[PDB]
Symmetry: C4
Subunit: 66 residues, 4 copies
C-alpha cells in the first residue's frame, strides 16, 4: 500500500506547509505592528496591535473549523 503511503504523506506535508504559510502572514503583521510600537512606544499602537491579533485569531478560528 505504498500508493497509500505516498499520496497520504506528500499531501500531508503539503497541508502542514500551507497552514504554516498562513500563520506566517499573520505573524508577519504582528511583527510589523510590533516594530511600529518599538519605534514609537504608543499605548495607541498597542491597542492597534491588539485589535490586529484579534482579527488574526478570528481568521484562524474561522479557518480551523471548516
Amino acid at each position: 500500500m505504498e500508493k497509500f503511503k505516498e499520496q497520504l504523506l506528500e499531501e500531508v506535508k503539503k497541508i502542514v506547509l500551507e497552514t504554516m504559510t498562513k500563520v506566517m502572514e499573520h505573524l508577519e503583521k504582528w511583527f510589523v505592528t510590533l516594530a511600529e510600537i518599538i519605534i514609537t512606544k504608543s499605548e495607541e499602537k498597542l491597542e492597534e496591535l491588539k485589535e490586529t491579533m484579534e482579527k488574526s485569531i478570528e481568521e484562524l478560528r474561522k479557518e480551523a473549523e471548516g
Copy 2:
C-alpha cells in the same frame, strides 16, 4: 478505497489548524506583554513575561497527554 483517505486527511488538516490557533492564542499574550516591556522598560514586566510563558508552555504540554 479512497473515501477513507479523504476522511483521514481532513481530520488531519483540522487537527493542525486547532493546534496552531491554540499556539496563536499563546503568541498573543507573548506579543502584548512584549509590547508593554517595550513601552515601559519594566524589569517587573520582564518577570511577568517569563512567568507567563512558563505557565503557557506547561498548559501546552498538558494537551499532548492523550
Copy 3:
C-alpha cells in the same frame, strides 16, 4: 501485522512536521535578528527590511506548498 504500517506512517508524519517547523523557525530567527536590530537602533530603513523579509519568507512558503 497492521501495526507495522501504522507505525511507519505516523513516523513520517512526525518527520514532515519536524522538517517544516525547522523551516519556519529559520524564517522566524531571521525575523528576530532584524527586529532586535530595530530595538537597538530604531532605524526605519530596518522596518523596510523587515517588511521585505517577511514578504520573501511567505513567498518561499507559498513556493514550497506548490510541489
Copy 4:
C-alpha cells in the same frame, strides 16, 4: 475497521501538540533574551541571541532524524 483511523487520529493529535510545544520552548528562550535586550541595548545580548536561536534550530534539525 475504522478503529485504525481512531488510533491514527489520536496519535497525530499527540504528535502535533508535541512538536508545537518543542518549538514553543525555544521561542520562550528567545523572548527572555529579547526582553533583556530591550532593557539593555547591548550588542552582547545581540550576538548571544544569535547563538541561542542557533542551538534551537540545530537541536530541531537533528531531531527530524
